[model samples]
Target: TLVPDLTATDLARHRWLTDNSWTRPTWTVAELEAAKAGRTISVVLPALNEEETVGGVVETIRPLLGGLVDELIVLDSGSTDDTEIRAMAAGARVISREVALPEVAPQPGKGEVLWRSLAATTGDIIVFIDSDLIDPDPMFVPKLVGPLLLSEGVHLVKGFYRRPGGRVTELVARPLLAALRPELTCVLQPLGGEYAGTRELLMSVPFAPGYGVEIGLLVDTYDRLGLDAIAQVNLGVRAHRNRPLTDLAAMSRQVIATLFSRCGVPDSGVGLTQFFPRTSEVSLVDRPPMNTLRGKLAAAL
Candidate 1:
């Protein structure tokens, strides 16, 4: 009765979704606070020149400070604009990437800031939000951290939504998962910018320092913790302006490189070539898992 066929390869995927998916309002701030049980939470927004939207994103989480969020940080990844000033004005403690983890030289990418953020805050849970979200919901933080706070064994909460289109998700991510990781195809928005995870699980996994971060984390989480450890929350409607196709091309290449490295395949070393004269050299290497470097931090100093 569970499905039309018992031999379906996607049976596990369907089951995982049924058990893991939840609506946005499934848990309220009051409910989440009661369930917090002394577990601290940190919200990190990795930003780069997102002056227009970063302030608003910080403002949404401002109300949650001290109750739901123990700390709200905007990890500035060398933003050319006033992302830091705007975020601070909006009530976030802005920390630059260079200062988060000074031992290692920082790389340029979204994941770079995210990886560095692990050292910047001490919390049982961490929620990552994109600084460029258009009309981000105040409930986003509570909803994302709900399962982690309340559910048993849930290590990660990935936020999905009803949006128009995801050029890279449909073209690159979907196909790649369907081929290599069929079980993960059920993830509606594997590349979605909103996700929350327990610090323990996050610190134990390597991070791809670019577009590969999402997929890399998804697969790594699945491999390390199994399907039950992951949950997806439907955040209703979400929107963000799309980037140009050329930019997406470079992002796609980085994603491909991350997947290959995880799959035990070596990168080709030939970077992404968009126009005839331009070739963007994307990093195929992933930052080491934070847990492995924890002991070496003091030694570096």
Candidate 2:
């Protein structure tokens, strides 16, 4: 049975559900090891103050170092605790958030560290798994990177697992997707922290600087490469800590902002540009605000 219930209206999305979704890891480690000849794989954990759980996560992934995974890095996002120490002890090459791209004055967000990680490491295929996961499986690494290595034309792999609760995803992300971007509603965990993508695709898109990071990436990937290039694997179960009510409230806003911005809500003519430039332009081009786009659409109507 398929995950989504789009009868005949949207064959494209329905076809994507059948073709792209995976029940489990079909490719073996040996297969991935052999398939990855020219391409290099980097598994990055974008973390902040995840000392308690980061060590175990790194330990689970450490064994894949020289074989299936080329680079295992813990990109610390200004952790006040011993996240760096534990990760390093577990055999991960730790690169702090600020040290990644020092010139741009580091910001405190998962996306900030992720954007900086592009400059920090040189891997053809990049896999990102959250550091704050509980009982993180070693299989997560192999499962996430397998499609990229084995499949043709697959650029991004998003890992969706059986989890008890995802309040933010259910409450904010899914509804927004069903409303604004119906095509992407098939994505099981739109805000899932585990996913993989090619460096070429990753570099081309803008990473939302706060909690909107996951949704932003997913949306951008779909916009850039379409559903054909995307795939989702069923990793058994993902366990993680729950955030407070206030924190979830903050995250929902960022998610909404990212969705609105991408849905052509337009700039306020006062959008902030990052110090790090994704393209080669001298200065960032500022487009007229959403008011202009709204007016234009109104006139047409």
Candidate 3:
């Protein structure tokens, strides 16, 4: 009755167990349109050098546009390409990641972009979508934001989808979470980039710096809130360019680092410095969890 049990295959297969599992077929325009009266939806795309697909990705938020989604902000993480230009051309407010929080230097991680997002946009409900997606869907926006607007007591909605070559999820993310945090084991795609959350909860959690952000959010939200506050929806199939094994290894390392750091395990070595392709320029040599947002939330209260 809580979150999914890793052992409950039978219950998962039953048709009655369909409410929180937000599959595509169950969604309708009526519910979203009806609920859009007062709620403001903020969609954020954390991108770096994704110019080719960023515009296309933003173009998909046609969810009857200017209706449910109030703002579409693209948080650029130091992309040397036309990522910012393209996103801006597609009618999105682009924010420089480094310039987001001036006092504190920008950290090297996707999680850093997400952490900075809170201060960038003011939305009652925040939805994060990956920019590198191929088959973009406007409904994906409504699908992620629908629960928070309509459902009661739901604090977060994670976008689950059918993906190909999820080697990292299959080999690392799933099994790693299975052994450590069993409560999070129910989530099929722990590393899913697309998820939605209320401003109250999102700003009040520690963000692990890097690919581990998704897992960190899942575990941290569970730790801070509870089982009932979270929901994962099936967003049909997702298609994205595959990565090299070497690249995956780097991602896996940070994911593990975030997992361990959040779990109270000590950091193995220096983590903040991430070198770009053939360059020697790297940001900081030190790293720490950005849990200060939660304190800000408390103080604001």
Candidate 4:
């Protein structure tokens, strides 16, 4: 039900809209065995209390160890559940948030883990996948990493799909990026959790400390790298656990606030309670990477 609308010239200048940007990469056992023969890769799964689903995701991508994924780590954000146990039990290395960047004094948000993972990995390319996926595959590894691995035109990859769209991304992130960072509008799924990029780009950029992380990276990437350096892939369908409207409201607010601060705009009037579209899920909202809570940003440049 979702098709990439590469329908015009302005956005089309981005090769991502052209056929050269298209890929549906699948790896064979032997191919993976031979991979990292040249370029190396590392993957990070920022998971929190995902005892039920994390195992499945780890198992699915486990085969990538020798084939493609040179290094893999599951970052558990103080999961009260057995996610850490099962991730290791499933054969993937697992580490807690506070432990990875012990010097950074971890915060409780997805973005925090992503920011820290840069320090934990040794790879040319960095990939991140959400752990709560209901349907995941090791194939997702090759598909996401291919553009960054094989293409000179693409420096970053954003996976788009007919994922659950709603009030938050539509009302907050989409429209805001449209106004503040138009170059990034070509990325149809700016908030997707599954994405991959070169380590140089991922580490040098500033990251949000809350739910706003996706848009934070999207805008930062657009600002640092031009449109031609970005690409999008069709990951088919993605079905994951959905939280309530109230739960999403807080996330939406942080998303908007981060956008305003980054773009040097006012954050006063932008919010969710104003529009009655849809969401809420209880979650922590930490400040930007380096705050009084922590020492300083992981790598301030």
Candidate 5:
């Protein structure tokens, strides 16, 4: 059986690996130095209207790139904000998604930005970080990319951090991974935005739009490439914006649909069941503010 031997008692007492045992096989400092002398690594941040948080994330990871990553690229999908400008100011080589590949027009999704970034970047390894991080630790880039440099036959490493995004990370992602992949339950944040993979493995997978992207990638990598080729890193802490309960419900639906499709579950030719009624404008005088007003404001105002 592919499932590991674990009784109900064992499952209740199971704890995540504490030491470096669960980390991707890593190189010694000497090995990293030697490799840095020869090859180049690239890091990409995919963004869409994340002007408020993009600058800090870019700057935090930029210094760590020395002797590790040769290029830091920011691929933006028509950000109405100053995401591109801030990224460039923070020493990233910024490119509008459409400009990079005029032949194939840029789509309106995070996965589309990532898929195109793989084509534009020229490196032996690629690391991806989301732009909405707040005060992210500097080691994020190295930790994500270290496994590929240190270990042979390792193709991908996913970063699992202390998810500061509460609803999606805890309720939706953790429960889904537990039901689908008990082995990967050791991973604290399975649906995190930070990940590192080789250009080769990236090109082989089909990119999905919306919340389905990360889950799809993990499943495909495990099914086709094997689990040994994958590893996870604990980044200690990460803080980012949390989606509302309603938005999380929408995300959960998409995630379930994607997983079912991957596992060959028939669609049944029925539209999704609405668990919650969709409300356009919630009266604010007697209600709590559930969403941000940043996106609602116009530049001319």
Candidate 6:
């Protein structure tokens, strides 16, 4: 079958497919070792204002992957915070999104950074990790890269981890998957941030901005490359800032919109659109009230 090999149940039952005692296949360790020997792996973390968490993520994964990965790069999107500085200090090659496409003027979004990072990286296998992760496990790099390197017919690997919205994930994401994609229900964290794929496949897809990027990629790959080419690995625990309810609402909208766009729901414009107003509205009144009550009272009187 040409569907993603790892399902949601497959994700839940095994901490990681490679580590699962009951589910361990004959090709597990041998494929991982072979992949380590033959392929060059590169890890990229896209950052904006992630100074606090970026350092630990980079430091923890570098040594753990050992010689399995060849390079680690941090692609920044004009971060005002100390994200760049900390990432550089932790021995990551820091590059700006501008450097990737000087002519095009890169947009400031995670997807843009990820797309640009591909240009800067040269590896047989490229793994993308979100910079905001706290207490990131090193196994993420190897787990995502291993399937593509060691197995035939596998071109992409998605990473599933213990995300912040554990119960919500079960209640919402799982149920949604059941209605929309029953087979994919086995994928614990379908909207996971960490994933690995061959450079060939990564370079070919068109990336959407913000939360839409992951969903867009998943759908695009499935349509063009088919399911046999994809795999999902369990990364144990992934700690990161929980999306506030408001933010989650926005993310959910983007995700669903992207899915609809992919399924050819006509005139669906889910991606980012830039608009510039030709004229500005100048305020004639000075010293606007700071509080809503004051402003309301002033208007009422």
> How many backbone clashes are present in model 5?
0
Error of 6 at 43 (Å): 0.5
Every candidate's CA RMSD: 3.4, 10.4, 4.9, 5.6, 10.0, 14.0
**Model 2 lDDT tens row, 1-301:** 1337553367444877887888766788888899998898988999899999999999998989999899999999988899999999999999986676655577667778888787677788989989988888889988988778878899988899886568888888987787766778788889888999998888777777666678878888888788788889998876656787656665676677777777776534233333423211111121222123322331221
lDDT of each: 0.86, 0.78, 0.75, 0.72, 0.67, 0.66
Lowest lDDT 10-residue stretch of candidate 5: 281-290
**lDDT tens readout by residue for model 5, 117-191:** 766677767888888887777777777777677766667778875544567767766666666666555556667
The best candidate by lDDT is: 1
Q: Candidate 5 regions off by >4 Å?
A: 1-33, 163-165, 268-301
The residue pairs in collision within model 5 are: none
Structural similarity to truth (TM-score) of each candidate: 0.93, 0.84, 0.83, 0.81, 0.79, 0.75
Best by TM-score: 1
Question: Per-residue CA lDDT of candidate 6, range 220-281, in tens?
Answer: 77777765666776677555555665445555656666555565554344333323312211
Model 6 regions more than 4 Å off: 1-38, 64-66, 162-181, 239-241, 267-301
- Tens-digit lDDT string for candidate 1 (31-56): 89988999999999999999999999
lDDT of 2 at 166: 80
Candidate 4: tens digits of C-alpha lDDT, residues 221-250: 777777778888777766645788667767
Clashes of 1: 0
| Lowest summed lDDT window (length 10), candidate 3 | 278-287
Better of 1 and 2 by TM-score: 1
TM-score order of candidates, best first? 1, 2, 3, 4, 5, 6
- Tell me which of candidates 3 and 6 scores higher on lDDT: 3
User: Candidate 3 versus the native: TM-score?
Assistant: 0.83
